Amino acid sequence: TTTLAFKFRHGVIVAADSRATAGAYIASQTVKKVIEINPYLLGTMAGGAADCSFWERLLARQCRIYELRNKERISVAAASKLLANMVYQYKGMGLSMGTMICGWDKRGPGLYYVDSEGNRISGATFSVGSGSVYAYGVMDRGYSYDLEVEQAYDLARRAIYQATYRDAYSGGAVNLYHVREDGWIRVSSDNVADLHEKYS
Amino acid sequence: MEYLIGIQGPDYVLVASDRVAASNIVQMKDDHDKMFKMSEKILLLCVGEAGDTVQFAEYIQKNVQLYKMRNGYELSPTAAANFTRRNLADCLRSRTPYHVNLLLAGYDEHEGPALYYMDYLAALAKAPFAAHGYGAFLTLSILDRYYTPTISRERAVELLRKCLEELQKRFILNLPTFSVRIIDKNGIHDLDNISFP
Amino acid sequence: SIMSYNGGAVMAMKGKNCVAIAADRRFGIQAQLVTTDFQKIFPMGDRLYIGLAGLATDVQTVAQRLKFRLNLYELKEGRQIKPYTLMSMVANLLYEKRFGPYYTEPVIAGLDPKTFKPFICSLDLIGCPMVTDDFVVSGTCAEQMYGMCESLWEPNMDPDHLFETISQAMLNAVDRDAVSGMGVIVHIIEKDKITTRTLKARMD
Amino acid sequence: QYDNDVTVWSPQGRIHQIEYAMEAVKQGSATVGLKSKTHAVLVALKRAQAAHQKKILHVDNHIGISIAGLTADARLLCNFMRQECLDSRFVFDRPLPVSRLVSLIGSKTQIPTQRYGRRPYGVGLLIAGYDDMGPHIFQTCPSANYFDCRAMSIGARSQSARTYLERHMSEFMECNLNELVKHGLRALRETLPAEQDLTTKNVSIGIVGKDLEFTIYDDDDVSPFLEGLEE
Amino acid sequence: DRGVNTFSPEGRLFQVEYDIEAIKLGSTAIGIQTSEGVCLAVEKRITSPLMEPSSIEKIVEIDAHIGCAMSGLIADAKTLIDKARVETQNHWFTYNETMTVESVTQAVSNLALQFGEEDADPGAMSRPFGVALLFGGVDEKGPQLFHMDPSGTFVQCDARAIGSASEGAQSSLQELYHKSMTLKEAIKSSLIILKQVMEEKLNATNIELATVQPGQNFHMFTKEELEEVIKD
Amino acid sequence: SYDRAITVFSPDGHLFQVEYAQEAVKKGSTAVGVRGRDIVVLGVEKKSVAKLQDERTVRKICALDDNVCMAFAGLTADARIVINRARVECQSHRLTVEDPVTVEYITRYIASLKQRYTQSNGRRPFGISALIVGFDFDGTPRLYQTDPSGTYHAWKANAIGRGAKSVREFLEKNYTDEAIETDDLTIKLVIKALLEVVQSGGKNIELAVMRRDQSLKILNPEEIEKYVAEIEKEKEENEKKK
Amino acid sequence: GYSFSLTTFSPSGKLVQIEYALAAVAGGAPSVGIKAANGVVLATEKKQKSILYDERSVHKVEPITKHIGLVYSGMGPDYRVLVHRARKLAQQYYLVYQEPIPTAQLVQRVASVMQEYTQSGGVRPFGVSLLICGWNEGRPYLFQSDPSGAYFAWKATAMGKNYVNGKTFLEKRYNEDLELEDAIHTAILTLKESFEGQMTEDNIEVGICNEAGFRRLTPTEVKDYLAA
Amino acid sequence: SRRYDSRTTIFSPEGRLYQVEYAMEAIGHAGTCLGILANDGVLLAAERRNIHKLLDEVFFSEKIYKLNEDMACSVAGITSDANVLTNELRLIAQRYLLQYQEPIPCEQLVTALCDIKQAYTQFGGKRPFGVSLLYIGWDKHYGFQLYQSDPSGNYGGWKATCIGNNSAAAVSMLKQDYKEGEMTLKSALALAIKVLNKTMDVSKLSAEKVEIATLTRENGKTVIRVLKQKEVEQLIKKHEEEEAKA
Amino acid sequence: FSPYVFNGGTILAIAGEDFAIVASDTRLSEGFSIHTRDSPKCYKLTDKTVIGCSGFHGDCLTLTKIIEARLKMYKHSNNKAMTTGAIAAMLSTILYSRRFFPYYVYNIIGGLDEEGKGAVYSFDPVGSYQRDSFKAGGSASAMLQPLLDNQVGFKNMQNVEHVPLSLDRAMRLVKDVFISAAERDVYTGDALRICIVTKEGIREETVSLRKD
């Protein structure tokens, strides 16, 4: 798995791969790793899929309950706080989870990283999975805050491609999302074999 | 990794820590903050495991702020420290034990400044200076060599810079920038972070 | 082990009409100093002292709970407590946790406020009291003080000889241990006064 | 006063609360059910007052019910029955019979008649089912007493239907399905104030047999059974 | 004295027959359905010219496709509404689809006659809720409206009024209904009914109005989206 | 345990315990609140001063948090309990969510607490009617109210306790935009209002004022007497006008 | 079980069930307790209403430990309860402190129980007021508890049927410097005024608290003393 | 199980509870108690009722108690119910010490009790406690402190108070003869001996139908001392002489 | 002791424009022996949805009973049959319920879409599902999955037409694939059962394989 996310002037961008393995046998190659929690939030899958789906569904339900009760969209900080305080009651059982919560609240964009151990932290560039190490190198050398939209897309795509080239437990297709002040949008879903020729 | 240090003067207190987070090969962050403000003139520096630090610190913070908004005055540091120690030793012998170390630098109007120490087993010593983490090995001696009870302010800052240079010279982990704060009769003050290019 | 995680040593002797108690004042974690002013001797009433050694957190916890119960006892009916009663109370307090216990080894020393008859006692990890007229020892340097107090002690001892006796033994017994030392504190009790002293020790 | 509680026998051995509950069944819309040699039928009235509530339910492929009391407490017994049948199918792999089910339902209802602060269920029930021994019609009252009858009806002014059935008793066991339907519908027709005739927006009918699993008919499928009336 | 689960010599519980008389003191509400959505209108019953009228919430949202109007005791209702919401979400959690209005009303009614002293009463429920609700929403089979009493006997309807003066107004609402009636005529009829039945006046502040027409979600009328129709 | 029905309906709905709890408020101590343009005022009064009492101890204006205040007009033992519960919840909310509370949140919390005790077994309803005030984010001063039944409405100038009827009748005819223009003006209104229920002048007043980021204030009798004399002079001038 | 109090405040502010219980000890087989320097004395009275009854089977003076005594005035059946409770609390105190329990603490705890049976769920107050003697650190102790939970440290008091006429008789005879030989005479003679018919030993029971342990006197001793 | 209950917690038709305002009617027939605070100490006086051939002076005292190193109480109601509130207060103070390792302020200790008897007016079904009290203590924040309490969880601080039989006449005669910040521990005892014989129904005091306690701070430590018969004899004699001066 | 077993029993599924297919072997084994040769692993829930399971047998049986008990509950409480997406969303939760003592079954569901199309859902023993077009879970997954992706997805084939699938072609493909995957795997053989879902209803077939 390789999932990355970063924020800049015109909001946040998320990217992920589409492979799943069971040992050394490729089960499927068309997985959805960018979860659509709500029309204003987004998630991410890494580790166990059942967990990273169940708990995020519960989170979405709680967000909707809050919106109904208080008549105001919830914030990213409180959402990540909820998600962290939910799985902390299952410390030392076998749960594996690594997640990114992204959004835009009254004080601007927001990106938080969460995991099953308990460390919840903000930031501006994040990447997790078995191929995060290869993607950090490409994301750093190329990152900038005063960037355009037509370029961050290519940046994330190239990072994911170069991560799949070396890592064996990651490959398949590349999914990319972009969040804005209004809501998020699905911009593209490419294939690695169709990108290899685009480059050399 | 981790590093906390505290120094006590005649009419002030000086605390410092590192600001870094990592997952076994890579540092995710470089602007962390290991400090917590329990009140206007009390500071808790916690460190240790992953998800226990924030839980414990926020529990303590809530209870102290509640005491304040309930009674009408604040809580003395010599009391907050024993409260922390009691709660931690109690939760040590249950299904959810916490694995953390902490300092509780503070200041008071009657007894003056204070500096304490804990070791995740609920000991609660007290000293005119103290430190945590592996780095403590390469910077405690220095204190014992150059420290005096009537140490002024800038001289304490210089001693701190000395210890940090020693760390960056003999220690393997990077730890390039630190957060430092001071406590005085008027309150808390934040100083320019000690950074090395 | 876990008992020696920090280190400690305490001793107590008996004389003619005055008793004594002594202890070391180091605090550290298994190889390292932190501070040299740690308190191990607590006053449980007047003419009655208690010293604990072992795990520091349990040291403090026991001290606090004992003060709780002792204050409630004193307030219920007004009488300064007797030493044997304190021995039994600590026994109960340590045996209530036979499973999941503490790790302290107490030592009690005091008089009787009706005849000023001296009394000293040593308990164990679970409350096995052992009253001795000679002396009592508790800590990690126990076999270095048994053989030291069995070679100097005598039946009747004046206060000054009692102070000169317990001090040499304690010092020359901790000078052969590495997880105990860095100061010595002595308390001598009398019929109408108490004298507290600190000695000159090596800081190596 | 021996009337305010359910744990106080009267000087003549009468628990007034159970009678006061029974008096709640003689106010609801009437319902009827009779037995044949092969099938079982149930009908109702659905007194609209301009919409009203339904009056028939489904328990399982071979058992159905008709209620004439408090609609809130009836759903409770319905759930009880559904769960009992699900359990019997999960464990033994066999459709639970009718006799044991009615016995269970009777025991479930006796407890609150014997302690403090409770009240008896104020609903009567008509049960229709089919098993190896043929069809079965059962009746249930607030008191934990269940009968086994060839024909019965409950509700207000249900005496006329009872008399009409006692007069037509020796005619079943050979009539066909539609003949049974006509007999039942013309028996129910007497529980009206001689000022209204049965229509499609009032009647609801359920039917069970050895070849069909308790089918219900709504207002739009009852018309086929209305032809053949008189004054 | 007497208990709470005690019957009368008529087959009628006592607390319920007594509570139903409470709704005869509350304000009035009207709910209507048609072939292309429903309509809910309610009254506020102001008392003083110093209360902020924007604080009176009598028409709430259960979900994007369900609504609710309430009369009687506005307090006892706050315990049921939440429940409904919860139920709905749990449905979407396990089945990834929307709950029916019949199901929602049934789940709410199941919580009406849960009260008595025998049980340990962890829920502490000691008496019935004095409220009368009026739901409404789109579903898999067209739009639906329902009515609920404090006894748990929900029944579907086509146009219903509840409240103090919901005795003669129901007649007028019984005359002015045809299956092919549209939404606008229904709204105007409900408004004129409330005018004739209300005492003080008919302003765009003393009313709340809502619709659940298909295609769209629950909607509340603004202060400006109202007066444009009162000019009759 | 105790599982018995304390509050129950009646032949007219008419929950009796609440109708009775509402009578204590009719004899407690008057209180007044006002929501000005950039200030909020609380003028609790009806104090029975004995000259041998520490004014600190019995106050009746309390802070639940730096944003919110409160006043009450009934039994004190229960008010203390309510205020403690509310402080607890304010802190828990500031914990889970990383931002302070809003007036409506804590008001709804208190209302749910009040209503739970009109339905639970073995519990007796509260006997207080509070008067909350606060400063939400982006300013927006807010004044609310509550009853022992569980209701709550947002008011502009409401009064509780004994004599609140006359206070409301006097206030509904004096609160105007042209009358509320400055901080010094909002307060005079409260003093003029309390002068009616007042018994022997300005000897029983515990005025306060909440402004943007002061977090509280209480006035000393000096300015109270100054304002009283100013009101007397204004009354003399108006009488000369008539 | 019922959960609500049956003892409640009256309009005048007084608990009435306590008074109604205090009216029971009025008929309670008069008892007597006297204090001296070398010990304390307790003496009851028996009302065997037949020769068919037995004598060496029923005992009113029951010990608590080796140094504390007991006697009552009122309902017998409600006295063994307190006896058992006290014998339990004494052993608890011993097991904890490894030392016999003093007297005052025992009276405190017993009264705490007698009061806890005053506003609990579905019970009534007891119908007895105890009298308990003891010896501690070289000094006697006499105490008297009530059904309300209040205990006083009395000195030659009396209670029962003719106490108003037994305490005035006991006031004009207490010299305060007596030995443990004539205090017994005084005890006997006091209740001798409240006795109908011929007196004997089988109609009397006695116990003493000297510096050797609480003891009960056999019929031989009572007979020897009954001889003036 | 419903025709034997009084429900014990019910709002009367006028908004008032009955059991509480009844217990307050018996409180007014108990041992007169009085409390004064002076710039250099705090004094607490009380009146006794038992005069017989009793074993007096067996304990520290009959009406005064202790709660910690720096507090005391003077309960003036039913004794049986009061013997448990002292235990509760001691438990509270010891728990506070165990947790914060510092002496407990007095206001906290008063509130934690006024909350224990509030539940007895709302939940349960039990009759409430029927005792009013008078706490004296010293803390480092406000110094000397005297506080009051009432059967329904209601408390308030004062400068000088009296409760029990004839407390109103005392409170009246006391609000005139009390100078603000112009008082000491030498004249406070005099005013106490004055009001006590101006209020008590006996012709005069014999120093045996009275009791007094003083709390002061002497060389850091805090002293709570009761006066011997000789001291009170000298005090009453000096009062007699002062009155003779008129 | 060990509370699990291995029985084998590969499963296969396919979806089409207006039809769905579910195929299974017919045999039960334990170690190196054979218990029986008539034990199908395909079951019918409603008139437009079938399901197959493989792995530990007791868990399979009890899970089928559970599903059948809950469909009736839904029908009773909502007065309507349950769709395919709903059954999948319910199965995810039923599985995750036992996250710390899991089942050991690899489920597959086939049926008709809401309107008229064909739908397939592949699951895991923990409850992670996703909609797919063709899946061959079971023991012989590695033997069939690499084949169905060439003749049905046309991977690694250039200048090839799409020529959408049909009914008889898919049936014959399934037959040939299972006839070939029996000479290499030892847990599979002795018969083959096919269940087909179409606009009309549910039809069944039967074929014979070699007996080892």
Side-chain angles (χ1 to χ4, degrees), chain I residues 146 149-150 153-159:
Chain I
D149 59 8
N150 196 29
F154 309 105
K155 313 261 207 298
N156 304 276
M157 272 158 47
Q158 61 169 2
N159 321 96

Side-chain angles (χ1 to χ4, degrees), chain B residues 85 93 121-123 125-126 140, chain C residues 5 27 32 35 57 60-61 101:
Chain B
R85 197 205 81 79
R93 279 201 165 91
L121 284 156
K126 161 161 159 44
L140 274 180
Chain C
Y5 189 57
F27 174 51
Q32 172 193 4
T35 194
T57 189
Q60 315 209 27
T61 289

Side-chain angles (χ1 to χ4, degrees), chain H residues 148-165:
Chain H
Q148 187 162 10
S149 194
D150 293 310
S152 53
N154 196 349
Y155 83 79
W158 301 86
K159 301 291 183 197
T161 37
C162 171
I163 61 171
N165 209 356

Side-chain angles (χ1 to χ4, degrees), chain A residues 116-145 147-149 151-189:
Chain A
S116 188
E117 319 316 327
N119 49 254
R120 167 185 69 91
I121 63 188
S122 170
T125 61
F126 276 132
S127 183
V128 296
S130 321
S132 62
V133 292
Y134 311 101
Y136 263 128
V138 175
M139 187 149 66
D140 304 335
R141 269 304 189 293
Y143 175 74
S144 171
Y145 185 82
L147 256 180
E148 309 286 56
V149 298
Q151 287 167 21
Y153 296 178
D154 189 5
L155 170 55
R157 284 198 272 251
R158 192 71 186 261
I160 296 279
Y161 160 72
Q162 300 296 167
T164 55
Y165 186 65
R166 296 256 164 191
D167 188 53
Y169 296 126
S170 94
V174 172
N175 230 312
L176 173 74
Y177 287 64
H178 170 191
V179 59
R180 305 242 283 287
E181 179 159 11
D182 328 310
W184 55 257
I185 72 184
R186 181 192 229 255
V187 59
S188 71
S189 179

Side-chain angles (χ1 to χ4, degrees), chain C residues 169-188:
Chain C
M170 189 70 160
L171 291 167
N172 299 340
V174 304
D175 288 6
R176 287 272 171 180
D177 195 26
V179 287
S180 64
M182 290 218 174
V184 170
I185 204 78
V186 181
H187 299 253
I188 313 304

Side-chain angles (χ1 to χ4, degrees), chain C residues 28-99:
Chain C
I29 310 94
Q30 201 165 56
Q32 172 193 4
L33 158 70
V34 179
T35 194
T36 48
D37 64 356
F38 212 60
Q39 181 176 356
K40 302 176 184 167
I41 312 173
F42 304 97
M44 330 312 285
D46 197 5
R47 299 180 188 85
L48 185 59
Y49 276 36
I50 193 169
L52 307 126
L55 227 50
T57 189
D58 297 15
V59 153
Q60 315 209 27
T61 289
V62 166
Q64 306 264 23
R65 268 154 69 83
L66 219 50
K67 203 76 148 167
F68 179 117
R69 304 205 175 180
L70 179 54
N71 290 127
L72 289 193
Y73 186 95
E74 195 277 345
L75 273 310
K76 223 77 80 185
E77 74 290 42
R79 301 195 341 283
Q80 287 273 308
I81 203 169
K82 297 194 180 347
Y84 192 99
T85 303
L86 199 63
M87 180 176 77
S88 316
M89 184 216 287
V90 184
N92 236 40
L93 188 139
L94 300 182
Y95 197 79
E96 280 175 357
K97 299 234 184 293
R98 175 84 157 88
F99 314 114

Side-chain angles (χ1 to χ4, degrees), chain G residues 16-37 39-48 52-54 57-65 67-82:
Chain G
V16 86
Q17 228 77 58
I18 300 298
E19 319 313 331
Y20 295 158
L22 283 173
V25 309
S31 308
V32 167
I34 298 292
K35 188 203 182 193
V40 197
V41 162
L42 310 149
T44 206
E45 183 270 2
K46 298 197 178 183
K47 180 36 171 162
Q48 305 296 43
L52 314 169
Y53 269 97
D54 209 2
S57 45
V58 278
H59 286 333
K60 293 196 176 178
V61 194
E62 288 267 11
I64 312 299
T65 188
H67 259 317
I68 302 171
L70 199 77
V71 80
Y72 81 83
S73 170
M75 270 171 190
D78 282 338
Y79 163 72
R80 313 199 247 98
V81 191
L82 306 158

